[PDB]
């Protein structure tokens, strides 16, 4: 079981009927452990809205992690996506609540259009997890963008994802659940060794003020199943509607206009039944796993806008930080991927020590690594840039 789970099992969560309405603000779903305890005193029927959440809060470590992700869309107008790398911790506002801390957003190979997004295969996918594991990190979810300008004088964006439309398209529900399937969460009471997923979906769109806001979703554990056996399709005309194919028979329970229980063929399936709302947070005490440079090293895969990771930008970057503490200079997830996977002087052989120095924020350890032979020749290479 995950480190957070071994801990939440060992912690009291009180202060079974009126529980849902005391530890307020208004919570939409019970936390996974509490709904577990609210019961101690899944393959291919029907679709009911899920009363529990595997993750209760998504928290970006600081505004900069999210800001820099968004520059891709600002500079291009193209939708962009990334993977959330980080860790799972306790959400102390909610008893037994699970928090997803986002330390870094990794931007993999993709094709972004104004109205479309394609997820190419990442030849570095595996090695990036390997680097991320050694930095105390794992994928906690994915984030994608859906920003369209509205007022080009104000600099604002359409509030297109709202109560009268959708929050998640059916296409993104199927994608979300797929991701949840490939990132299962580990628990005993499930006939496989795993129940659910802790993989979250972040959405950058216009909010009601036509500024950018960040919203968090997971998809129901039922929804997980229908896509796992490919029983769920999206709809061409309307983003708010799924569709069940024909293989088993499912449907949902609405309520009509004199207020009684109902049941109708999922033809279509209103996305609202599949969606699990997670709250989204920027903390007042910000967190700096990675360092914030005034002039950061470039984010990866930014060909299409003329930001490139190469030994010219590293020469530049390194020369702007001669007076900076070396650990602060090097504590950057995107620098580190480049340092490990570049095709000129890769450092995959002698990384471990440095990545340990970044993960534990150890200065003396990083300083000795700066005296490594492979860093000296890295510096010999940079100094030949003019």
């Amino acid at each position: 079981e995950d480190e957070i789970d071994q801990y939440l099992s060992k912690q009291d969560g009180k202060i079974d009927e009126d529980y849902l309405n005391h530890l307020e603000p208004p919570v939409k779903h019970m936390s996974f452990h509490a709904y577990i305890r609210k019961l101690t005193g899944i393959s291919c029927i029907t679709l009911n809205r899920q009363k529990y959440r595997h993750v209760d809060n998504i928290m970006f470590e600081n505004h900069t992690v999210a800001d820099r992700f968004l520059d891709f869309w600002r500079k291009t107008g193209n939708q962009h996506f990334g993977y959330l790398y980080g860790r799972y911790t306790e959400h102390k506002d909610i008893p037994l609540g699970i928090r997803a801390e986002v330390a870094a957003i990794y931007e993999p190979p993709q094709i972004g259009t104004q109205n479309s997004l394609e997820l190419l295969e990442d030849p570095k996918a595996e090695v990036v997890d390997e680097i991320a594991a050694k930095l105390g990190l794992r994928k906690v979810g994915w984030i994608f963008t859906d920003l369209v300008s509205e007022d080009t004088r104000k600099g604002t964006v359409r509030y297109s994802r709202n109560k009268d439309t959708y929050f998640l398209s059916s296409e993104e529900c199927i994608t979300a659940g797929d991701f949840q399937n490939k990132h299962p969460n580990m628990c005993r009471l499930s006939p496989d060794g795993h129940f659910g997923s802790k993989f979250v979906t972040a959405v950058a769109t216009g909010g009601p003020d036509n500024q950018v806001h960040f919203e968090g979703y997971q998809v129901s554990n039922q929804c997980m199943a229908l896509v796992r056996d490919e029983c769920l399709l999206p709809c061409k005309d309307a983003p708010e509607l799924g569709y069940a194919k024909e293989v088993p028979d499912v449907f949902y329970k609405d309520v009509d206009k004199f207020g009684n229980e109902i049941t109708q063929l999922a033809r279509p399936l209103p996305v609202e039944y599949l969606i699990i709302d997670i709250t989204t947070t920027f903390p007042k005490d910000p967190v700096y796993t990675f360092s914030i440079s005034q002039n950061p090293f470039p984010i990866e895969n930014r060909d299409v806008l003329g930001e490139t990771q190469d030994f010219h930008s590293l020469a530049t970057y390194l020369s702007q930080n001669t007076s900076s503490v070396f650990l602060d200079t090097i504590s950057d997830f995107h620098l580190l991927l480049f340092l490990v996977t570049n095709e000129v002087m890769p450092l995959q052989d002698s990384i471990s020590l440095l990545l340990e120095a970044v993960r534990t924020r150890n200065e003396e350890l990083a300083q000795t690594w700066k005296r490594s032979e492979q860093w000296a020749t890295i510096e010999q290479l940079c100094s030949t840039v003019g």
């Binding site: 939708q79 190419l120 994608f144 398209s169 199927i174 994608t175 797929d178 999206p234 709809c235 569709y243």
Partner: peptide
């Protein structure tokens, strides 16, 4: 209403 339009790995943002 109409459905078929899907291959995984590719999201489309329906505008109108």
């Amino acid at each position: 209403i109409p459905n078929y339009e899907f291959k995984l790995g590719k999201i489309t943002f329906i505008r109108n």
